[PDB]
Amino acid sequence: PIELLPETPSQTAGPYVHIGLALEAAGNPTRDQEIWNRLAKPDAPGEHILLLGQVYDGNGHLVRDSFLEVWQADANGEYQDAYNLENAFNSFGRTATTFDAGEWTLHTVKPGVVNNAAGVPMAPHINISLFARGINIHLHTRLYFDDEAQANAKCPVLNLIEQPQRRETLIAKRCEVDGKTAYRFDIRIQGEGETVFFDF
């Protein structure tokens, strides 16, 4: 069968992932430009929301050294791939949970709808990649919103997950933090209430 060149293998990000990818979070001087946690400037179109969550290991303890990359569409359901800190909206960002901040947070707007490859709509969601010491290869997940139940019920990816009880672990719960629309999305890596992770 046809073998191609094999992909470089992954390795853990390690305890100090902050020093190279989260300069301010590890409290080291930053550079002019940083890829960080604010995907939307106050004047970007859409409903502005705040995202927050915590990450738990299999013993129910807090992972205080994880790093997270997020990828989502803008409010009109479009992916903004040209990263520029002058943009009113960037579809990419990074955040982290530190020994200080047990909780990560992201400032952005609610994604519009994008279609799958077959033409079917997917429910608004935000793609997340989780990195940390003890993770050999990163984990991929999706964050969907509880106030979108109708679109959630017909999401064709959410629908690939066989058990209904597991679909709920990907559903972030609407709250209000300082009178601003917030949703909490906690990640359980292992055991009871274990978040669904994907491969693609």
Binding site: H61, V63, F92, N127, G134, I135, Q190, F200
Partner: peptide, 22 residues
Amino acid sequence: ARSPRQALVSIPQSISETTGPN
């Protein structure tokens, strides 16, 4: 303690998966 015990779930590639920041 940081490895999942369920199987990952395979999902076909869409625009969410085949695009990234430049």
